[model samples]
Target: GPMVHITLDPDTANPWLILSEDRRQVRLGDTQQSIPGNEERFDSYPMVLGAQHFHSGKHYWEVDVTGKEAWALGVCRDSVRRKGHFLLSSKSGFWTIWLWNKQKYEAGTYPQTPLHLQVPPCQVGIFLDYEAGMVSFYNITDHGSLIYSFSECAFTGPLRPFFSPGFNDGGKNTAPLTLCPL
Candidate 1:
């Protein structure tokens, strides 16, 4: 397995999202910080991106979403808009899966589809093959069972790992979204 280590880019993170000192974990802060506005930052969503970008190759990464009631994980184009409310589909340059209320699961595809799972996975695996035009999500806790796939993706530029711990939910979902070690 090819593992890609990623660190959260604070400059691109929402003000309400806090990145660990090592940048491997991102959690929702109780209060918003006065982070200056930037084009790369995610203003509407509590989201952030990896400091490293992949231009071409097969890359894989796993995230530990344990203890979080809501979260989003996957990949996004480097040029995706960060200023306002945006769709989370591949058409919008974001290919992601989300877990809400600790039960409801879904993938951010065009027309967005719900994912049926007996139980939420503690960890998630994201696999990307740029040249092959595919992005896949797996429930690593379920022994790498496929959760969803984004095929026929045309990458015009570099792609970066994306994450959102969801809103703080009144301090309920404060758990950090952690990048796990391979």
Candidate 2:
């Protein structure tokens, strides 16, 4: 698979997120660190955006979500609202999937589509076709099984990779979200 590995932009990350020096991995910290509130910063959500944005062509990346109890992964419009809470839906400029309560899986569609897989995928592959206006998620541990796809997106701006390693829940959900080697 042709992959475009992501480098998370520290400036755009929510203050609670602690990104590794490589910017390829991240986790929710125990305390919110002091960080400037830049125009690109996420004011509410514990999320981050890739430094690179896609305006044309296809791009792909995979994440190691093993042992992560709660997390979110996918793409968001570069110009999407950064302040306050927003639903992770295509209509909200986010094409993504998430896991919560340890095993509940959902596609962040308009109505939050519940996703039931034969087995949980430790690694997830996100494929984005910008020109086609499509973004799909795959369960790599399930032999690249299809998870969900958001098609016919109304892409008004460049799309950037989005990530959220949900906050640690009494250490039960402290596992980090890792970027796999391309």
Candidate 3:
């Protein structure tokens, strides 16, 4: 796909992204496979995603929150690999991007920094990019003004990634991973 952005109203959200660690809910892309739950330290949190997980070539994706309050994006593995493969998130205005691996949810692999995407506040809009290779975060209300980018960033979990929608359940949240395919 070139650019994908899905908008949802908070009042009616079926299959919404959930929040873990008191985190909001956002959307990301990954393979479509079921990963087993593990008992790892880093494996038990969200991750930042980048070129490593996404297919090469031009690519873009985004999610719009019209009714929801906040959201978070995560990167996970196939449940086969082990180790702490996660990284911290970066924020710009009202948006944040997390990165990690796509083969193993526990293997350690994080970018020095993350590409944060944000706008004014509660501003309803979508962000996208068609050019692949690098993970780009931009401002939707501002005509896609790129905020951050990274290459060292990557996926560390499953091959079947996904984009899910959910509400924040205090500090204990578990979002379904989404992946981009060629």
State every prediction's TM-score relative to the real structure: 0.96, 0.95, 0.38
Root-mean-square deviation of Cα positions for candidate 2 versus the true structure, in angstroms: 1.3
Ranked candidates, highest TM-score first: 1, 2, 3
lDDT of each model, Cα atoms only?
Answer: 0.90, 0.89, 0.32
Worst 10 residues of 1 by lDDT: 166-175
Best-performing candidate as measured by lDDT: 1
Model 2 vs. true fold: TM: 0.95
Model 2 segments beyond 4 Å from truth? 168-171
- Candidate 1 vs 2: which has more TM-score: 1
The sequence of per-residue lDDT tens digits that candidate 2 reaches over residues 1-182 is 44886898998999888899999999988888898988989988789998998988899999999988899999998988998887788788889999999889999988889999888999999999987888999999999999999898877778899999995455566678999997
Q: What is the lDDT of candidate 3?
A: 0.32
Give the top-scoring candidate (TM-score): 1
Question: Which stretches in model 3 have alpha-carbon errors above 4 Å?
Answer: 4-54, 66-70, 74-86, 89-118, 121-132, 152-182
Better of 1 and 2 by lDDT: 1
Q: How many backbone clashes does candidate 1 have?
A: 0
How would the candidate models be sorted by lDDT, starting from the highest? Answer: 1, 2, 3
lDDT value, residue 137 of candidate 3: 50
